[PDB]
C-alpha cells in the first residue's frame, strides 16, 4: 500500500551480467560492441545502447 | 594647383605634411578565435563544388 510507479523492466534476473548487459538505467546497454569510430570521449553511447 | 615635389623640378624641399598615426598602432588585444572541430570526422559533407 504505497508503491508509486510500476514500470515493466526487462527482468534483470534473467539478463544477468553474464550477458555483459548493464541494464539498470532502463535500457539494455552492452559495453564494447557496435561502437562508432572517430569521435570524442563520449559519443560512445548513443549506440552503446 | 602646384608644382608637386617630384613631378616638378628638383628643388629638394625641406618641410612637408606627413600624416602619421596618432598613437602606437600595435598595442595588445591580439585577435583570438575559438575553434570548434567537427565531432565525427565521418559525416563531413566535403561534396559539392
Exp. method: cryo-EM
Residues A17, A27: Cα–Cα separation, whole Å: 14
Residues A40, B37: Cα–Cα separation, whole Å: 10
Q: Is A30 helix (H, G, I), strand (E, B) or coil?
A: strand
Q: Which residues between 18 and 47 in chain A have a beta carbon less than 8 angstroms from any beta carbon of chain B?
A: 36-40, 43
Residues B38, B49: Cα–Cα separation, whole Å: 20
Chain B interface test: which of A35, A39, A41 (most B C-beta within 10 Å)? A39
Grid cell locating A22: 548493464
Angle B15-B16-B18 (CA atoms, 0-180°, nearest 5)? 140
Cβ A10 vs Cβ A28: under 8 Å: yes
Chain A residue closest to B37 (CA)? A40
Torsion sign over Cα A40, A41, A43, A44: positive
Q: Is A44 helix (H, G, I), strand (E, B) or coil?
A: coil
Q: How many CA atoms lie within 13 A of B28 on its CB side?
A: 0
Amino acid at each position: 500500500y504505497g508503491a508509486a510507479v510500476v514500470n515493466i523492466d526487462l527482468n534483470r534476473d534473467f539478463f544477468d551480467t553474464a550477458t555483459g548487459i548493464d541494464l539498470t538505467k532502463g535500457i539494455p546497454l552492452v559495453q564494447d560492441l557496435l561502437v562508432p569510430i572517430g569521435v570524442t570521449a563520449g559519443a560512445e553511447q548513443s549506440a552503446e545502447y | 594647383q602646384v608644382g608637386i615635389p617630384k613631378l616638378e623640378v628638383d628643388h629638394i624641399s625641406f618641410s612637408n605634411v606627413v600624416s602619421m598615426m596618432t598613437a602606437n598602432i600595435r598595442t595588445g588585444d591580439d585577435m583570438a578565435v575559438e575553434r570548434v572541430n567537427p565531432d565525427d570526422v565521418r559525416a563531413i559533407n566535403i561534396r559539392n563544388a
